[PDB]
Amino acid sequence: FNPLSLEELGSNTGIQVFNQIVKSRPHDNIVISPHGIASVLGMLQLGADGRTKKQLAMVMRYGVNGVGKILKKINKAIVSKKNKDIVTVANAVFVKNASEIEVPFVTRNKDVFQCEVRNVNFEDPASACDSINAWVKNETRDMIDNLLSPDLIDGVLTRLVLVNAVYFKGLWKSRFQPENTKKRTFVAADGKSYQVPMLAQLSVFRCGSTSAPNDLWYNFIELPYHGESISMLIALPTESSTPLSAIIPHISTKTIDSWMSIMVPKRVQVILPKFTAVAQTDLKEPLKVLGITDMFDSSKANFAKITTNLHVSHILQKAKIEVSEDGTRSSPPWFIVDRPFLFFIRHNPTGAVLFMGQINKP
């Protein structure tokens, strides 16, 4: 009903997926787009029927029909040039014969999710991956490539593959200066030291601390982008003897809301790895854990609203963010990101969580 609430449901679904992956891969770099996950489920809901649709609706806690206009408004508002800081999103449903597809499914997807339903020759795995990769690269300002390999495709079997790709860089409201960018020690999960280029600036930023449910403390900071609609949030443990895995469980939009009412602006020396965060993942397994099983099963899958047989083989998401310099008394506290950390990219007007990442090694 309410735009902010609707986005909250979607972002939390996306975050729950992140929480799964991160629990299974505690020491890897994981970069997900929680909102992209929400969109990808909406895309599929447009074509589902019977139990397949029922599982999706139950997990998402809403139906696309009758909320589409709201979903659409949110989606266009995230990618809008009005943001000044530009988020690039590429959504596609790759299908073996795109001509046979029902029009509403194609139409609704383009309208609501800026999703293209495109055909591909799965009978030729390699060429198939070529086309998909060529499309992602072309659709992401050439910032993202290499999503699929032939090995992920079954030439006879594969009939449907979803793709969600998100890229972002933007410009800081308060720039970092290159003269201040120095190589510094980052202590990764293995406990080894790494030499990393790090941005540094002394400036006013909203920041805080709070404890996880288990009483382990951590610090967080907000770094706004110049358009003032998007901001990065960063959290890492207060004590070096606290692993990132001890503070990230049970994180949800509520946690982010909690930070909002704790953060106050203050003068801080910020020290942050200059790096590019990028990860790809197949959403299939985590989605099953949430209770969405049919769409992945050869027999039980029911996408009668796509074609008048059909199941989802993979749902691939690739997220890529660059963190760089570019932008517009008593001793100050420091915020030094020198150990594994968590970060969000948030679209504040809608509350959409565009990025969520765990960085174990920049």
Swiss-Prot record:
Recorded GO molecular functions are:
glycosaminoglycan binding; heparin binding; serine-type endopeptidase inhibitor activity; signaling receptor binding
A Pfam family matched in the record? Serpin
Asked if the Swiss-Prot or TrEMBL record annotates the protein with the keyword Coiled coil, the reply is no
- PROSITE patterns given for it? SERPIN
UniProt key word Acyltransferase: no
Q: Where in the cell is it found?
A: Secreted, Extracellular space
UniProt-annotated site: Reactive bond, residues: 329-330
Keywords for this protein: Developmental protein, Differentiation, Glycoprotein, Heparin-binding, Neurogenesis, Protease inhibitor, Secreted, Serine protease inhibitor, Signal
Query: Cross-referenced Gene3D superfamilies, in alphabetical order?
Result: Alpha-1-antitrypsin, domain 1, Antithrombin, subunit I, domain 2, Serpins superfamily
Among the record's GO biological process terms, what is one?
Answer: detection of mechanical stimulus involved in sensory perception
Looking up CDD domains in the UniProt record yields: serpinE2_GDN (cd19573)
* Gene Ontology cellular component annotations, sorted alphabetically: collagen-containing extracellular matrix; cytosol; extracellular region; extracellular space; extracellular vesicle; neuromuscular junction; platelet alpha granule
Sites carrying sugar chains: 97, 138
According to its UniProt entry, what is the function of this protein? Serine protease inhibitor with activity toward thrombin, trypsin, and urokinase. Promotes neurite extension by inhibiting thrombin. Binds heparin.
Q: To which protein family does this belong?
A: Belongs to the serpin family.
Name of protein: Glia-derived nexin
Q: Which organism is it from?
A: Homo sapiens (Human)
Instruction: Identify the taxonomic lineage of the organism of origin.
Output: Eukaryota, Metazoa, Chordata, Craniata, Vertebrata
Corresponding gene? SERPINE2
